[PDB]
């Protein structure tokens, strides 16, 4: 992680297996019940988009929900792009560039890149932003798929 309490500069660490393994057991014991969201955020202490992608990937148990979460990530990522016109284009290759949806999501950003955004004047919380989009995906799942009936 890195964006924990921001009291870390270019500093970074790989998600402790303790924490990662914890995510697995969490969804393993509780599935997608409403409590899957809170524990997710807890085991996501301002981490990098990759670390987050790792977590999701770790417990991507069934394509059913993973689809709902995927569709949402994509839509949010695209929305970000809508209001981020790259204002007349990122003319000339060599600039750090404004983070794009696919970049914040991790698909088109390198681990180093993500670090760069998380350690720059003004810090672009790529991981934190992405962590918000994922949660929107999780809570949409939970809503339209979680409990049984009026028991």
């Amino acid at each position, epitope marked *: 992680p890195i964006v924990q309490n921001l009291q870390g500069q270019m500093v970074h660490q790989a998600i402790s297996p303790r924490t990662l393994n914890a995510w697995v057991k969490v969804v393993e014991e509780k599935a997608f019940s409403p409590e899957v969201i809170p524990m997710f955020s807890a085991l996501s202490e301002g981490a990098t988009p990759q670390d987050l992608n790792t977590m999701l990937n770790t417990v991507g148990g069934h394509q059913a929900a993973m689809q709902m979460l995927k*569709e949402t990530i*994509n*839509e*949010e*990522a*695209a929305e970000w792009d*809508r*209001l981020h*016109p790259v204002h007349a284009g990122p003319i000339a290759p060599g600039q750090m560039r404004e983070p794009r949806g696919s970049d914040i999501a991790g698909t088109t950003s390198t681990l180093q890149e993500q670090i760069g955004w998380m350690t720059h004047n003004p810090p672009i919380p790529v991981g934190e932003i992405y962590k918000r989009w994922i949660i929107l995906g999780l809570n949409k799942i939970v809503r339209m798929y979680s409990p049984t009936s009026i028991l």
Partner: antibody
């Protein structure tokens, strides 16, 4: 029952300015981006711009950049557009539309629109 | 901006038949496997009405009669079966680049 209520009609003389409103109701104003669209009778919809109540971020259409200024008043759930140096051209129906806060993004609610008349 | 060219200015669709209007963007309105081309309808005097979002996703409370299709640069709003009340103006808008743009519209009139 999210209500985007805005003035029926407005008459101003050329060279003046007018601040059109759009008193949002029903939903939590700071959730969605308010957009503004102009449409001259017998014509399509031009995009004036958009603004986000909880941040003041805006995106104006280069065309209107210089004519229209988007504002808001979170306190009283109302978005505004101030049209400068009004001329006969500006006479068109001005709609205010909410951009849904959720994943499926698109214009989900429209105000009935205010008709402007810039005449002598 | 990112221009959208709508095919016919007007189109007379006989009742029960199929109305086909098309919208062509100067650029691909695609992103993350999503064609962000929306279709709206408009009755004289009132504000627009979303029919189809995401190029083919029907909106809420829009009769199945309205269908969407397209990808990247070419899109089409297909009405079938065409019913009387459908006399309206139709526009397509790209929800892809910051300066959202609209089409010049198509006037779908019912051929009686």
């Amino acid at each position: 029952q999210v209500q985007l209520q805005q003035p029926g009609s407005v008459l101003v003389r050329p060279g003046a300015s007018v601040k059109l409103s759009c008193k949002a109701s029903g939903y939590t104003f700071t959730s969605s981006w308010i957009h503004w669209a102009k449409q001259r009778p017998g014509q399509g919809l031009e995009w004036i711009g958009e603004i986000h109540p909880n941040s003041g971020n805006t995106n104006y259409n280069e065309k209107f950049k210089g004519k229209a200024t988007l504002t808001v008043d979170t306190s009283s759930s109302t978005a505004y557009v101030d049209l400068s140096s009004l001329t006969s051209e500006d006479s068109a129906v001005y709609y205010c539309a909410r951009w849904r806060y959720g994943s499926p993004y698109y214009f989900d609610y429209w105000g009935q629109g205010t008709t402007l008349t810039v005449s002598s | 901006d990112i221009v959208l060219t709508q095919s016919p200015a007007s189109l007379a669709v006989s009742l029960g038949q199929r109305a086909t209007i098309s919208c062509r963007a100067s650029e691909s309105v695609d992103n993350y496997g999503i064609s962000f081309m929306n279709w709206f309808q408009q009755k004289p005097g009132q504000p627009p009405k979303l029919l189809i979002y995401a190029a083919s996703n029907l909106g809420s409370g829009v009769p199945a009669r309205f269908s969407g299709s397209g990808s990247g640069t070419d899109f089409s709003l297909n009405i079938h079966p065409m019913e009387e009340e459908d006399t309206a103006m139709y526009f397509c808008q790209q929800s892809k680049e910051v300066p959202l743009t609209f089409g010049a519209g198509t006037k779908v009139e019912l051929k009686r």
